[PDB]
């Protein structure tokens, strides 16, 4: 099932447990914890729906909200797990080699471990130092330097 939407059978308030609250580009929050659980409370403490939520998910409705049911409460990419940015501002790219660590599809690949992964923190405004960025195999960042990306945003990672 390629559909990443989560359906709710009955109007039970979502009870998200063991989650990390990270401010995103919008009012929603992105969870950075791999182990997450959902619980439904409607009239009593007995749960009816559990499901499971991977890392990098965005919740449609906040925790404790009495969802009417039949609507998505959390949305996430069913193919990729986004990597959150702790520092909001320009993306700092270190040791960017063209022709070897660049793959045109701007959307460009970061680096290839087999072909050769520099780690740098996100700039504050333009190039200020404020976080370690890990680039595994086939990892691609579509945000160029100076993009001034805000916290809670992620580009396509292109898993290997």
CA distance 87 to 103: 26
What's the farthest any 2 CA atoms get from each other in the chain?
Answer: 61
CA distance 2 to 130: 38
The resolution, in Å, is 3.5
- Structural method: cryo-EM
In this structure, which long-range contacts are made by residues 137-140, counting pairs with CB atoms below 8 Å and at least 24 apart in sequence?
A: 137/112, 137/113, 138/109, 138/112, 139/109, 139/110, 139/111, 140/103, 140/105, 140/107, 140/108, 140/109, 140/110
End-to-end CA distance of the chain: 21
CA distance 153 to 160: 21
CA distance 63 to 41: 11
């Amino acid at each position: 099932a390629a559909e990443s939407s989560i359906q709710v059978k009955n109007k039970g308030s979502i009870k998200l447990s063991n989650v990390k609250s990270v401010v995103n580009s919008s009012g929603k929050l992105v969870i950075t914890s791999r182990n997450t659980e959902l619980k439904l409370i409607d009239e009593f403490g007995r749960t009816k729906e559990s499901y499971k939520v991977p890392y990098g998910a965005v919740l449609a409705k906040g925790d404790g909200e009495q969802v009417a049911g039949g609507e998505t409460v959390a949305n996430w990419d069913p193919h990729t797990m986004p990597v959150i940015t702790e520092v909001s501002g320009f993306v700092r790219f270190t040791d960017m080699i063209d022709g070897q660590t660049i793959t045109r599809q701007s959307s460009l690949v970061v680096l290839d471990s087999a072909e050769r992964r520099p780690a740098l923190k996100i700039v504050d405004a333009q190039g200020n130092d404020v976080a370690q960025y890990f680039l595994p195999g086939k990892a691609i960042v579509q945000l160029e330097d100076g993009v001034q990306i805000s916290s809670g945003d992620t580009l396509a990672r292109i898993p290997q």
